[PDB]
């Protein structure tokens, strides 16, 4: 797996790829690892597929319930703190996952959460077996000043590198842009394919 999350001025961009392996055997080319879990919040999952999925459902549920009881969306830091507690409570029988939780409250935020419930905010983060290659690309090419279209390209690029050097990663790239104005928008396939072509790339 390769998932990545970056923050900008008034935006958050999340991307994954879609490959699912049971060892070296590519069982599904087209799984889903990026999920919207609130109006302005998304989550990416890496690690054991079963555990990750159970958590996606709990989160969707518990964040929708929060919203109705409070009439505001759960602050992104609160979402991370909630998960911190859930995962830690069961650290010795854990959910075997790596989560990125990204979104917009008063500002933008990306949080990275481990299987023991340690949560940390950074201005970018990546998770999964392909994550070090993304970190390489981001270290070199990321700027806080980047526009949204510059950022969308950046992640497409990063993941496309990760894909080439991680046999655990592959398939079409999913991207989502989260803004205060238009909310969580999942960029449509044909627009992403268009940019892979324009940057000159493969899968």
């Amino acid at each position: 797996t390769t998932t990545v999350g970056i923050t900008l001025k008034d935006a958050v961009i999340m991307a994954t790829e879609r490959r699912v392996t049971m060892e070296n055997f590519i069982m599904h080319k087209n799984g889903k690892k990026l999920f919207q879990i609130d109006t302005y919040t998304g989550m990416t999952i890496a690690g054991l597929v079963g555990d990750a999925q159970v958590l996606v459902r709990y989160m969707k549920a518990e964040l929708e319930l929060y919203r109705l009881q409070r009439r505001v969306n759960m602050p992104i830091e609160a979402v991370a703190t909630l998960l911190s507690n859930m995962l830690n409570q069961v650290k010795y029988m854990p959910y075997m996952v790596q989560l990125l939780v990204g979104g917009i409250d008063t500002a933008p935020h990306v949080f990275s959460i481990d299987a023991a419930g340690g949560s940390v905010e950074d201005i970018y983060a990546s998770t999964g077996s392909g994550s070090p290659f993304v970190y390489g690309v981001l270290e070199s090419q990321y700027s806080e000043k980047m526009t949204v279209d510059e950022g969308v390209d950046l992640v497409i690029r990063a993941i496309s590198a990760a894909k080439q050097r991680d046999s655990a990663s592959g398939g079409m790239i999913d991207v989502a842009v989260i803004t205060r104005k238009d909310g969580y928008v999942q960029l449509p396939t044909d627009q992403i394919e268009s940019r892979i072509r324009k940057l000159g790339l493969i899968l």
């Binding site: 459902r57 969707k60 549920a61 929708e64 319930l65 109705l68």
Partner: protein
Amino acid sequence: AYDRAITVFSPDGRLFQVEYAREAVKKGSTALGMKFANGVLLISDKKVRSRLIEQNSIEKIQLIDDYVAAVTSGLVADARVLVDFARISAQQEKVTYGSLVNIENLVKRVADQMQQYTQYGGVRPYGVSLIFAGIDQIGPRLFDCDPAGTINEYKATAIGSGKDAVVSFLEREYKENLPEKEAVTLGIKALKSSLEEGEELKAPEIASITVGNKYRIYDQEEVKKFL
């Protein structure tokens, strides 16, 4: 007499304590719901009590999820506790199957809780009625529920003090498959029907949902245009 304990049948086969619990429902303000063309709506009276109470505080239409809403009438504490139960119950169904396929079953789960408190000694019944309205894989749905745990699906119904004036009025005027804007008018007429002698009808709440969409709560500016 046989009306002092929830577990005691009268000789005619009546649970009087349940029937009294039902009298608590009549003290609530009126609310109604009705099905229309590819949609369902709820309307509920707001008896304003004071300048000093916040208005967007306890009003009576509560979303259970994005596609399901409810109005209550009766003891307010018990209404709250049931709505919160209904909400939790909807999320459990969604975590088990990933979607609320039939709303009838959410209502059934709530109604079951309510009935349970009419069979064991040491608890009193919930003094509340509810209306549940929303869209699901069957279509638009409108239900009601009472202290006894009794369910009925309706085309239009009401709950609260003015229930009878309103059910009586819809019995004569209601038509299937109106457009939204007309249903809302017909609703407001029904509601006005229920007040006595040239008494004001201040801004009610209205919420609607139409197939393929999410719930929408009319804001009081939009609601005024029907007064």
